[PDB]
């Protein structure tokens, strides 16, 4: 993954433009044709998010956002892909994502071949091999009776999951029934796929919109280890002060942080982020401002 970002209310004009375009995007095929691809939620906090169905819901909330108040917007992809007919759809056959998926499939097919009586298994002897070196699933078929032919099919990472009970495809593009009298495995060009599944959500973004003038400083900027600096005293003399929690508990930078929202001498809404790798210095600065 999620892109986290903080922007100002003024900068939210660009967010409105982008979210408007996202909200206009619909599936162009399959079961969800005409429904929105994106789910947008808006609320004061991450615990008070609500789904919106029109961009004006966001515009109204952004326009009404008070001085030193904030709004959270989350953007979720409800799951989409372009299918073989060039339509954007909500469901698709799952893909092999790694070596373990290919290896599992080889084991599954090998086990299924012992007892299966459906599709290809009915009319063909089946071997399925996971080649550790090449990183491929290799399926080898031979007709059980009559003039015996064979076919080998290679399946890799990123391919759609296959199903030997489903109708394979021949050179005409037809999904052909393996029980057709005269069917031979050497006419298979590709194997049939497993059933389509709903594509999973992907959280794309969490955008915090703050109606404030934003700046980030060190604790040293405000406090020298003993006394507030001149800048520290100006901050401490701000009005309608709200000082946030103790720390950020680190992220992937070292830096901890707290925020001070205040109204400056001119009446401007300010939010000052005070960040430090050192966690004692930050909490000392913090205590001096209280």
Structure tokens at 119: 């599709």
Cβ proximity of 50 and 66 under 8 Å: no
Name the experiment that determined this structure. X-ray
| Alpha-helical runs (H) found in 175-214 | none
Task: Answer whether 160's CB lies under 8 Å from 194's CB.
Answer: yes
In terms of phi and psi (left: phi > 0; alpha: psi -120 to 50; beta: otherwise), the region of 70 is beta
Task: Provide the token pair at 272.
Answer: 């000052």
**Which H or E run contains 222?**
helix 219-222
Q: What sign has the CA pseudo-torsion 207, 212, 213, 218?
A: negative
| Angle, CA 83 vertex, CA 81 and CA 86 arms, to 5° | 105
Domain regions of the chain by residue span: 3-93+199-208, 99-194, 212-289
Residue-wise burial string across 43-81, b where 16 or more C-beta atoms lie within 10 A, e elsewhere: beeeeebeebeebeebbebbeebeebebbbbbbbbbbbe
Q: Where do we find the tokens 């952004």? A: 62
**Cβ(99)–Cβ(160) under 8 Å?**
no
Spatial neighbors of 280 by CB under 8 A, at least 6 apart, are none
* 70 beta partners: 210
**What is the β-pairing status of strands 136-143 and 124-131?**
antiparallel
Task: Please give the CATH architecture assigned to the domain spanning 3-93+199-208.
Answer: 2-Layer Sandwich (3.30)
d(CA 268, CA 51): 32
Answer whether 39's CB lies under 8 Å from 51's CB: yes
Reduced to 3 states (helix: H, G, I; strand: E, B; else coil), residue 284 is helix
Task: Count helices and strands (H / E) in the chain.
Answer: 7, 16
End-to-end CA distance of the chain: 36
Question: Which one-letter DSSP state was computed for residue 186?
Answer: G
């Amino acid at each position: 993954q999620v892109k986290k970002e903080t922007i100002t209310k003024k900068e939210a004009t660009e967010l409105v433009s982008k979210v408007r375009d996202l909200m206009s995007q619909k599936y162009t095929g399959g079961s969800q044709v005409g429904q929105p691809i994106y789910e947008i939620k808006v609320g004061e906090t991450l615990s008070k998010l609500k789904i919106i169905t029109n961009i004006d819901e966001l515009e109204k909330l952004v326009n009404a956002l008070g001085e030193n108040k904030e709004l959270i917007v989350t953007i979720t992809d409800k799951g989409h892909i372009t299918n073989s007919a060039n339509e954007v759809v909500a469901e698709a056959t799952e893909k092999y994502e790694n070596s373990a998926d290919l290896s599992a499939e080889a084991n599954s097919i090998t086990e299924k071949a012992k007892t299966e009586t459906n599709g290809i298994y009915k009319v063909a002897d089946v071997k399925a091999s996971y080649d550790s070196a090449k990183d491929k699933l290799v399926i080898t078929l031979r007709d059980k009776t009559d003039t015996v032919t064979s076919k080998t099919i290679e399946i890799g990472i990123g391919d759609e999951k296959i199903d030997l009970t489903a109708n394979p495809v021949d050179s005409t593009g037809t999904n052909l029934d393996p029980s057709t009298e005269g069917f031979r495995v050497n006419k298979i060009v590709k194997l049939g796929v497993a059933g389509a599944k709903n594509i999973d959500d992907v959280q794309l973004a969490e955008i915090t919109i703050k109606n404030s003038d934003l700046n980030t400083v060190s604790p040293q900027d405000l406090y020298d280890g003993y006394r507030l600096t001149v800048k520290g005293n100006m901050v401490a003399n701000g009005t309608s002060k709200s000082i946030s929690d103790i720390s950020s508990k680190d992220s992937e930078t070292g830096k901890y942080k707290f925020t001070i929202k205040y109204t400056d001498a001119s009446g401007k809404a300010i939010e000052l982020t005070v960040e430090s790798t050192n966690e004692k210095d930050l909490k000392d600065a913090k205590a001096a401002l209280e």
